Amino acid sequence: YEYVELAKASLTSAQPQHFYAVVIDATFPYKTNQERYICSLKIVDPTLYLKQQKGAGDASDYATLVLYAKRFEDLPIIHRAGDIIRVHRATLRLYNGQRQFNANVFYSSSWALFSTDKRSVTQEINNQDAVSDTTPFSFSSKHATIEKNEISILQNLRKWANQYFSSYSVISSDMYTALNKAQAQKGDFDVVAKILQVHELDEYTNELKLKDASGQVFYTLSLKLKFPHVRTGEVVRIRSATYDETSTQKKVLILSHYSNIITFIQSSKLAKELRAKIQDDHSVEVASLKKNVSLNAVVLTEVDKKHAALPSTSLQDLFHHADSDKELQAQDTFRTQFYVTKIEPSDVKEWVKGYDRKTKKSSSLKGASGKGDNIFQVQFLVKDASTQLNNNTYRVLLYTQDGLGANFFNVKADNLHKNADARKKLEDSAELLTKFNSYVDAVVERRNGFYLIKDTKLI
Template sequence: MQTTQHNNSTTSNRSNNYIYHSLGNIDPDSQDQYNFFGVIIDAAYPYKTSNGKYICTIKVVDQTIHHKGESSSPLFANVVIYAKRFEDLPIIRRVGDIMRVHRANVKFFNDMRQFYVNLQYNSSWCLFHQNQDKDDDDFDDNDSDENQNGEDQEMLDQDQLKEKQLERQEKRRYKPYKFSGRSYTFDINHEKIIMDNIRTWGQNYFANNYVITKDMYMLLKDCKTKMSNDESQEFDLLCKILKIFEKDENNLEIRIKDLSQEMWFMSVPRFKFQSLKQGEVIRIRCVEVNLTSKRNVIQTKNNTNILRFHPSSRIATELSKVIEDETDMDKVLGDEASDIVMNAVVLTEITDSSLARGQMFKLTDLFLNFDQIPENLRERNAFRVRFYCLRIDPIDHREVVQAYCPECSETYSCETLEKEGKGKCKSCKVECKLIYKMQMLVKDSSSQMNKNFYRILLYSFDEDRGNDFFSNVRPCNLYKNADALETIEKQIKAMTKFNVWIDAIIERQGAFFLIRDTKITQVIN
């Protein structure tokens, strides 16, 4: 790709060789080879096939084949490029770029035109930026050969300078930033008009349409449930980059969120994706969900591609507003590698691993809109939540353990009981057992900005409802066990500290939510 050979002359013999067709005017049953321009709306990363060839698939549209709006089903043409070597294939970084293809074969595949571009024969491709006029492209397009010579500059007056600048701009507009083979041709007289037309059309198309429709990506909130049945399944995403961290020499950790407003983590190779920016809306191709991680982790693969959007495209401007920025809850979830969250601690662990990876519920939804939660989830009655405690009752921590009557559910203070806490119910005369009876006034990120707080109970009348909640202690008479009282008081104190969060499973019983399958595992002094 070193030697570039422009072919700007009208007298060239080759200038008449290329007749360009609109995508929709190409007969898919034809045996002919076709030349065309297309606006790229999607592209995979090149990968090696089982027969040792390299392949790259790209979706293109033009004035004659495209879909409109958000909901319409995607309409495009597929371009499949084959090559012997990886480096002969295009790596697409931005949707909206223009692709020119020479000598493609065509077939109908899944009701769409599919173009075959075989670089081992005589096919070729060129890539052009969507918009070369504005200085808004931060891609390295290796234009150093066009940099002006300082000596020349001094000899020119203002008008001449302007003229030169225009000339250079003009030249840049029609210069591909990547092309296959060793050289390319561009017949300025013939192709300029086609190029200008498709560029203008493409810019308008992206400015007025979402282009990426709902059936072209998965929501982050669905990827665990939909993928857990088949671990090898790949999917695509559409999300916003909340934060980028330098993970190590070779990798960046990016935090992403999409329209489901869930935050996920993704580690990406630095050399492939170093131009990504915080706040940017991106399309991610070919990823998997990491089902073994406790955090929400998207796993990249060799053929994962991340595509950026032109800043003026509708999907980028609208989604960057609709998708939330990082919330305080996200900061807690992203407990690693961030200076902001350095002091945030999640005090507890969920002891049931199948629940620990479940979806996180908002307290507002559970307490105020419980009926709107899907029936199957309400029936399961185990909701993962993350909250912080404003206050814990009773204030007298010796009363946190109570004597409970299994017959009438009445509870009594242990104050008058002996050390073992043995005692009988005053009305039923049956043996009581010792349980935790504690109330937490809590908030989560959904209620952080309003006055609402919620009451969650640690009420361990049932064995698996929280007898193991505190670390290194079980319910006992706290009036007579000084060591146990100290152990519990220390943990209660930790629960109400600033930036300490409780990750818990709660279940609904009548009008109350009770903690279960949750244990304090962190020690804070």
């Protein structure tokens, strides 16, 4: 197998050609008819990556790769821009002014993806390790071979890929549309924005909250199985999206089966600048707390920074598998999301009780401070996506006698029967917590079969 560079590949030979390249863009493998699937992507290498810069405006140059197959599983799933792809037996031809490489995987063509970073997107999601630096993390057919003379090629292009993404945007301005101009588009377009929030809408669907450089916020539905790599704080490129003219409560982007959501490799200058420049927005949330019914989800809390790297556990696992799952049994501190259906005790004034640390008893303060130290003893009845359909509601406690969750309300415990100020803030918070589309993001500590909230405060 002889590998040729993109700009040197023969246009006349029409013979099978092979090459190594960097993927900067790609659609998701999509079905076209009762027997064919397609995957179109943009590729570049040391010889083809940028247009004649002087009037080009630092616009990236690239060749295209169109892989045809009879089965969905015979095509590559590009989750990240910057990774490398190796193609065998591809025929090149000029398509509307550009070098278009075509390969029929259903016949004799094959491909193989290599990770530019230490781990592939999937290996990062599962916290795994790559077999080696010459091992493909994905490939077509039952076998993939790598000869010794390739290592130098692979290792070199990997170094180039990082020099390229760190020096240039790769995904230039002409490759995406500003979100605040989305409504002006005739058809579909592309986006480059940061994920401000990943809201679990239901069992199989995530609702992404996006915001790009234009400062405009948009929401879009992202299937869990299709795009399992979405993560808050990360910048992604969305290939093919449409403006939803039928949504009036919030700005919504519509994706298609061929649409794709792609992240960037660590060295990406574009992704790095955007993760910093673009800052979280709560304007949508703030404005929603004024409406009787908000069609926009609002995350009222925020967990302590030290837990931001902690994965979340559904209520289904927390209450139905915590005593039978080997893994869940070894943990006492978990993170989870949910919405409050009801709060107890009903009377907000009883939320704070006097606590006697010697008898381990607490009592009402309707009879004054003679009950001991003031503490919060609130029992939330919650529910979430993983338990949305069952006939259950689960108890999540906020017992601060030991300091856990003492600042949840941003209101220090006090006799709510006498302190009107403290009582009013809590009653208000109570209306927000039980209001539709209000959710809680919090860490909980397991204690004697119960979950107590900790390291979690309001917004």
